[PDB]
Design a protein around this nucleic acid. Structure first.
Lengths: 56, 120, 122
RNA sequence: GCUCAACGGAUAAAAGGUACUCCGGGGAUAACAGGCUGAUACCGCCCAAGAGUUCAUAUCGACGGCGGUGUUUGGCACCUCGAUGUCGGCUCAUCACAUCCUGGGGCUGAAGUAGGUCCCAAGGGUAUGGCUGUUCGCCAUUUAAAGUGGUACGCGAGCUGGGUUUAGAACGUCGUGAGACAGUUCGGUCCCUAUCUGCCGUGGGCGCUGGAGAACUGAGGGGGGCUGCUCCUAGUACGAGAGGACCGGAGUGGACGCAUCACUGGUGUUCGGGUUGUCAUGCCAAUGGCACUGCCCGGUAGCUAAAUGCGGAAGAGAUAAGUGCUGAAAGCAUCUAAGCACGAAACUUGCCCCGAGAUGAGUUCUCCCUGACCCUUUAAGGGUCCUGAAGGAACGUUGAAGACGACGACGUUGAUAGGCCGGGUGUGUAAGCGCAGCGAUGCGUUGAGCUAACCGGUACUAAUGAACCGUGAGGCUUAACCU
RNA sequence: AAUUCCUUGUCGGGUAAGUUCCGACCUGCACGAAUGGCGUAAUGAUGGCCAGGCUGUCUCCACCCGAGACUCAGUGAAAU
RNA sequence: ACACAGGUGGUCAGGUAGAGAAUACCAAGGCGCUUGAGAGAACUCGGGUGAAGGAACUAGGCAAAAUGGUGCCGUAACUUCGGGAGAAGGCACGCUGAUAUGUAGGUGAGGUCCCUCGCGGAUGGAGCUGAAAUCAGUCGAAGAUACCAGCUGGCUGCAACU
RNA sequence: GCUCGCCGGAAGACCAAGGGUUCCUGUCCAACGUUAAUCGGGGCAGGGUGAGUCGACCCCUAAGGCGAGGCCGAAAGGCG
RNA sequence: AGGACCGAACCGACUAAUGUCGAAAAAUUAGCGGAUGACUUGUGGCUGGGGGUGAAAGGCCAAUCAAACCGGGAGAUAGCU
């Protein structure tokens, strides 16, 4: 249930191919406050679609 | 394989699942807005909505029924007296879901669930 | 549904009380017996004067089934028990004459028409 | 001189047992499996007395010989003793044909029927139980048949541990005893998260050469291929009678496989009700929590079988055994050398699924793109700013889609999901109130109340624009068509 | 037979079928009288067999509820 | 070896039901076990339910399933006369009213009687201890309703038995 | 702080044993906790245990040990 | 009255699953046997390696038992690897 010969560092790297994270690239700037909030996510202060939504 | 199946387990047995919604609903009504995890928030939508629909009418039977579940005199008095008349006109949809951030410590997607009104 | 090692209540005056199936006939590795089939049985409980005796082999036709049958409209006829009618191992004719309880309509074969006439109901 | 007879004499004195075991080494040497061989066994061929009523060749076929296969019991000791780790069963198989069943034919001492024997033929199929640990085998009952073998006497990094080999114990027998066995009898630790190859599924990258969105072509590959019984023909052909077809048609089944919940049912800890114990709600009442959903009675949608439908095929092409035809060598004759026509579940298709990563990378339809420039080794080039389309991805509501990806619908010009409204279904007459009853309780209001995924509507709530990725006319050569 | 090789002895009961089981026979391969012999109520987490009851053990699995498995975030081994 | 599902002497130990220090739910008091969030595949582990058949599975009824309580009735072969035996196998169990100041049996005196002068003896036996059985009615499919709680019988080897 | 769940002849409250400041407060988060930590039995500093009646010690002996002389034994030493 | 029966505490460890680099260097869960006695248990003593103890297996003697552990002879010897 174990290895037979150790895998090469080359074969090690190929297994790490599909491990890079994906960047966001969807930072919608708010209409009024202009924060860098994600789409369909409220801002850091609680603004969404140009509205004090959180009341906080 | 849950074809056409509803509900969510939320990694809990039924009794605990049910009892935490009994607590979460009353926690909402007393505060009108709470922060919770997103999947929990979506499942709360199928619980409080029946109660506001239960408060759109009023009787003694409904008062006992909304006391049958939710088990609180304070909440049932918060219900049937203010939330009912406040939502007398709306045909369903008494909750809003706002996705806040990410709970650093378990990376959970948290969200804000509140009443539609919240007029101050 | 009748299969091997299935106890059957006797339904004629052949002289038995309890019989046990051993081998569903008609086809290799057939696993079930419906209302109009021949099965091979043994005798496990008999009256002292009957035509047969305890420990013989012969055939039967399972006339009543707790699973029942399905009529072409979808209706079912489920009895309370499992009943058989003994046969003659070569000529297939019933041994006893008087047959108790109801029988189904689907037993209506030329080779079971004798049984149809002797049954009281249905 | 006595003893070295194991006779170059371990000094002239020295018998056994062990699976509590241990250590050093060996595949230098055994047991399991492989390999080589093929005596023995298994199969086939040759000769043929003779039996067979006559008739050797219908069949055997003594006596003998010539080979084949590598499945029996053995021979050798080549691989392994710094481990190839187990007898059988179970689950799951694959291949061979020396074929058990089904199919196609030849001959008879085959009337028919039903069999006998031989040849061709591997596609599918090829029991359930009783005793034994068993393989095997005997028996019971079936079935169209319950084929012979190779695969480490297939399979134990897949399960089991009964057998068999551990330390306990007893019987009989042998031995003075320790213990032993052509012996049997109870009990007795079966470890491993998969790197690679392999296989079953599912995606990412780039390429397919201008890019993108779809519909197919089809190389090639895989699945599938079983059959019983009854009736019509007909009780006809045939027959001495008794019996009794072929061929062709149709219905109805067993096993198996694919597909689906309309019905029959299963489950349904998210739906309704009953009820025991107990705690809390200040008490009664009415509810709620816990005791495996506390214990249970029903039960929607899904999923599902025991349920309900469907399939095997026909036919076509070229063939095997075999049947021929017309026909020379060999005036004849001859199925054959020329040629020509039939002839199987076999073979290539037909039927269903996958399928252009089929780098030989296909085809058709459609949509989008027609910038100013510097630069250098004027290169299918890069760089600067300007434009960034068709479309795509991400994000979001999500799904009878799904492990994650992926895939399908929708994203407000919107019914995608929740909620809501009505209906349906399920559960069986809520709560409160009023009457009668000593009361438990019962009756009226009430086929009520409450209803999870289901069905039809409804924007009440949540799916915000836009951004990001993707470009700017598509190398060279030759040829044919037009200036 | 906890002992019997031959052997699944032979006969009878039980079973549709019984190498195990119970009774019997006697050729006791190789029983035998305190290395105790033959029976024996009760008792036994004892060996073997049969029957009723009861059931998913099985025909043949089907569905559902939880803990992992799978995905995301943090930490982070092992034999070889 | 660890912030380890293990082990560690003595005292205290309430309420309801219950025979009980069993068990179920709770009090006092103490805790939610020191990785979570979603998903709701195959397969594994801990469990719930099952149409029809019911040991046909298998080395073997292994495991599960089932039996399971109280009162009353009834109980074989065999036997060392103790047993076997709770053999086997049956019937009633909830709740509410009366029958009957809760009957039967029961301690026993203020009291009357009593002598050697007795937190006293005899008597009715009050007061009261007081089940259960029976009759009538009522509810549910099910009344020992949960947890808890024997599977039973027959033949035989061996050993007496704990 | 408000609800909810679990144990409850215990996962409760107290002593002996054995450990040895882990007890309380201020303060800090590198390392230790199987993750994060402004939290802690972790680092750092300060503080905390008061007895004629509790326990120990003390008086008395049990099993048993040691043992003036004594007896035995190469020595050591053994028995008493 | 009982080396009596049923059955918790306590003690023991028959069956099955899980585990097998485990939570654990023999445990957990579900059921089981004894449970007023040849019982069990706290504290403190006495018996020691070819000996102690043993309801007897050759079991246990500090996770070690055909003979403990520590140190020494000892760098034993090793026709074997």
């Amino acid at each position: 249930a174990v290895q037979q010969n150790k895998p090469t560092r080359s074969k090690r790297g190929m297994r790490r191919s599909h491990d890079a994270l994906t960047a966001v690239t969807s930072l919608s700037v708010d209409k009024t406050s202009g924060e860098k909030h994600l789409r369909h996510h409220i801002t850091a202060d609680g603004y969404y679609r140009g509205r004090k939504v959180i009341a906080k | 394989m849950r074809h056409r199946k509803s509900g969510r387990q939320l990694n809990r047995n039924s009794s605990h699942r049910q009892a935490m919604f009994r607590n979460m609903a009353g926690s909402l009504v007393r505060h009108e807005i709470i922060k919770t995890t997103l999947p929990k928030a979506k499942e709360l939508r199928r619980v409080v909505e029946p109660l506001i629909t239960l408060a759109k009418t009023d009787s003694v039977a409904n008062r006992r029924l909304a006391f049958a579940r939710t088990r609180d005199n304070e909440i049932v008095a918060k219900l049937f007296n203010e939330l009912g008349p406040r939502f007398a006109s709306r045909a369903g949809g008494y909750t809003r879901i706002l996705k806040c951030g990410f709970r650093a410590g378990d990376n959970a997607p948290m969200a804000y669930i509140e009443l539609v009104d919240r007029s101050e | 549904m009748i299969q091997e090692q299935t106890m059957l209540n006797v339904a004629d005056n052949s002289g038995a009380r309890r019989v046990m199936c051993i081998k569903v006939l008609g086809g290799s590795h057939r696993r079930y017996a419906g209302v109009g089939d021949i099965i091979k049985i043994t005798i496990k409980e008999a009256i002292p004067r009957g035509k047969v005796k305890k420990g013989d082999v012969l055939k039967a036709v399972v006339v009543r089934t707790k699973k029942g049958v399905r009529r072409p409209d979808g209706s079912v006829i489920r009895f309370d028990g499992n009943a058989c009618v003994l046969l003659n191992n070569n000529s297939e004719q019933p041994i006893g004459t008087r047959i108790f309880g109801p029988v189904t309509r689907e037993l209506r074969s030329e080779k079971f028409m004798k049984i149809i006439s002797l049954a009281p109901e249905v």
